[PDB]
Design an enzyme around this catalytic site. Structure first.
Site: not given
Ligand SMILES: [Zn+2]
Ligand SMILES: [Zn+2]
Ligand SMILES: [Zn+2]
Ligand SMILES: [Zn+2]
Ligand SMILES: [Zn+2]
Ligand SMILES: [Zn+2]
Lengths: 484, 484
Positions: A170, A262, A271, A336
């Site tokens: 996953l 980012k 991912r 969060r």
């Molecule tokens: Zn983040």
């Molecule tokens: Zn993934």
């Protein structure tokens, strides 16, 4: 055809020669001492984790790989906080299996090495590779127990390792394939295969809106990919009314950071920003497979964090399900935000404990790296249970502080009740934890920041390079012991 | 003339009004109930750490500052790992004293608040300010105990706080004044004033060369400022042959980073890169003042880290006193270089324990900030002793891991036995600790990374903004308990 992995221990002072395991000793006897003879001819003894291959010793096993198990009686290492013997076995067996695979052998029998569960974990975790999307793939290796005396333990190891491998799959799968909906569907099918005593609800956006989860929604909106709130129930307790244990996982399928974008370098690893959801959901699948006599609920808010003309804007104030307002100063501190709503919802189940996992902060990585998962908890009993479970699995945990000192830095907020990033740059994992605590009133809560153990290069010998799926086995062990 | 600081507690449910301490109650009686009357007139009750000033209540005390002490029976807080009542007192008393100082009052009598040591610590730590180099200075305030019943405890508090203030002075003083030689001379005079049962040796460069401390020397050479190796002995044990406890401190008087030069922003704070030496030396001065019945040795290698035509060059290999070679990949990871030689020398004393302190890594700051000092130790007994001492002082410690996982990342070295910076950027405090461990064979060693608690903004209520001198009091307490 068929390969064989056998173990040998480090020689003890009063021994004349290093000792084979029972299986190694039996095989040597079967071949009239030929294994010992050739091992002696080959030179220096095998040390922990090292391997050597011998050909043509038996018609049924054209390739025999002997692996160094280290000291036979290696138990709990006081300094390392883990059972050393188990770690030696996992590493040794993984190394042996990789050699068998390099020789392109499709099936292998594995020596239980005095601990079949650990041997199975080394083989199954060790051979794993996510290669669904490649033309060139290594040979698929079928590993089975050598002998018929340690079946339950071997299978227990296969089950634990399989749970971790599901988490790894996953996490490793690219985000364009592993979307919120896809992750939910894969978890749904795995849980249903594990047990009929399950219910899965892939809650849609309309439900999320009905639940007034404004914080989670604010994160999801920047992307075109539909968000979902995965809710899973495993009814293993004999008493249907028995309060459940609740697990919560951060499921950001891809994190670009949003408007607070980012840097480009290695952003592909994001991912796996859904690692929190992967580990807790996989742990529950395994618990169901084991048919643990306990009720468990898994909650995983899932969405992407992308920049666009609809995305969260720095300074925006959002309202959590619990009515608290949050100033979103940095859109990359999104985990969060979605967790605030999931943690609030978790209280509705009147749970026995609440455990959440999240690839939450780069600060955690700077703090402990891949050595151990950071655990923030308001319960020493809970810390202890997780700690003891980790000694057994070798997938270590380390406690981090939950102090008002850190809380002060997040409630000191210009526009709202709580700020999504602290006043200063120091202790990022601690202030993130403090933020989460503002959404928890439960007496037995633990927050696991798994950002540092998201990947493996070569630190854990039995895991090939890539997403690690840690600490799935520690969670399964905790549940097992809890059920007993 | 004279000011007075009195405490009042938070009201308990069955009380009709909040309770004054014994001294507050006695003063109110002395003024026929006038204090209670005016406090009631002023409005809302005083909560923990808050203050209110009342004028003209008594001819001897024209200004009376009442301070909120919080809950009277506040003891050890299980979640915060400290004695809450003591922390409430230190904060409240400091706030009261700062108000007296703002009113420009030269002397103040302070309510013992049920714990004279904590009250004294709040007053002495609270009023401290390094202002030797300024024309404009606040009024010098002389704080003394109100009453004559709690003298030893009040004085104990003054002693503990004074030790910390000495560390603060040494850390705060600009590096052009606080050179290796100057720091050594100030420590020498303070230790000699504390006790005649002391010996101080400010070892020169020739001695350092004789001791083959090549690692320490490599750091010092880039600068024109002469290096010194401070060695101090406190012979408090009744038996002169009793093995000593050894403390080691990193004494980089100024760290520019060297060739691996630091960024300009806030580089001035690096004048406190000798905080490790300051805290351990001050702790020993205090132990001597208390005349603890134990033998103690303090070691502090002192020098500057500057760029020049003679400085350490990235890639250079140096030989430690113990014969181990070190690849200096980053010249800013210099603290561990000078510590390698000091730790080796520490073993020559055949000590009972070895404790070192150092403002070692920015990673520690990212990890825990100013919440607690990070402690790496191979002894749970030692961890426990430091932990218990910290609960009492409120200057908290938190354990960090000493795992081979981190060691592997520093002994994986291209040219030498050990690399001075890890393979990866993760877990910087942990790999630095692992580096230090390669120079330690002792069974009871603890490394304190104090980089995160180097300064105070407003986190510790009783410390004004500036160098903190933490965790000096925890070290003194540890020694006291050890001696008993
Ligand atoms: Zn983040
Ligand atoms: Zn993934
Ligand atoms: Zn994220
Ligand atoms: Zn200084
Ligand atoms: Zn440096
Ligand atoms: Zn330094």
């Amino acid at each position: 055809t068929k390969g064989l992995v056998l173990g040998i221990y480090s020689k003890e002072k009063e021994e004349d020669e290093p000792q084979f395991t029972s299986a190694g000793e039996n095989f040597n006897k079967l071949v009239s001492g030929k294994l010992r003879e050739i091992l002696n001819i080959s030179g220096p003894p095998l040390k922990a984790g090292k391997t050597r291959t011998f050909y043509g010793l038996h018609e049924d096993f054209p390739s025999v790989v002997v692996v160094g198990l280290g000291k036979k009686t290696a138990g709990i290492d006081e300094q390392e906080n883990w059972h050393e013997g188990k770690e030696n076995i996992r590493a040794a067996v993984a190394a042996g299996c990789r050699q068998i695979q390099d020789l392109e052998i499709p099936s292998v029998e594995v020596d239980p090495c005095g601990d079949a569960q650990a041997a199975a974990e080394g083989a199954v975790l060790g051979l794993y590779e996510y290669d669904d999307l490649k033309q060139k793939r290594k040979v698929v290796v079928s590993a089975k127990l050598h002998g018929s005396e340690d079946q339950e333990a071997w299978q227990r190891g296969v089950l634990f390792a399989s749970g971790q491998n599901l988490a790894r799959r996953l996490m490793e799968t690219p985000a364009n394939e592993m979307t919120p909906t896809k992750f939910a569907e894969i978890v749904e099918e795995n849980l249903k295969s594990a047990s009929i005593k399950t219910d899965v609800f892939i809650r849609p956006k309309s439900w999320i809106e009905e639940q007034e989860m404004g914080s989670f929604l604010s994160v999801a909106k920047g992307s075109e990919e539909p968000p979902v709130f995965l809710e899973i129930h495993y009814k293993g307790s004999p008493n249907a009314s028995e309060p459940p244990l609740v697990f919560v996982g951060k499921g950001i399928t891809f994190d670009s950071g949003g408007i607070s974008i980012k840097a480009a370098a290695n952003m592909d690893l994001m991912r796996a920003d859904m690692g929190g959801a992967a580990t807790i959901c996989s742990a529950i699948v395994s618990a169901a497979k084991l048919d643990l006599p306990i009720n468990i609920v898994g909650l995983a808010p899932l969405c992407e964090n992308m920049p666009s003309g609809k995305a969260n804007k720095p300074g925006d104030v959002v309202r959590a399900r619990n009515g608290k307002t949050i100033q979103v100063d940095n859109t990359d501190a999104e985990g969060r935000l979605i967790l605030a709503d999931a943690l609030c919802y978790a209280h509705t189940f009147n749970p026995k404990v609440i455990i959440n996992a999240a690839t939450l902060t780069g600060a955690m990585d700077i703090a402990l790296g891949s050595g151990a998962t950071g655990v923030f908890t308001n319960s020493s009993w809970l810390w202890n249970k997780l700690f003891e479970a980790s000694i057994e699995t070798g997938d270590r945990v380390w406690r981090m502080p939950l102090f008002e000192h850190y809380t002060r830095q997040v409630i000191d907020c210009q526009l709202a009740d709580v700020n999504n990033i602290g006043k200063y740059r120091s202790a990022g994992a601690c202030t993130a934890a403090a933020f989460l605590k503002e959404f928890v009133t439960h007496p037995k809560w633990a927050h696991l920041d798994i950002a540092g153990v998201m990947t493996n290069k070569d630190e854990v010998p039995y895991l090939r390079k890539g997403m690690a799926g840690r600490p799935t086995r520690t969670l399964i062990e905790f549940l097992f012991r809890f059920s007993q």
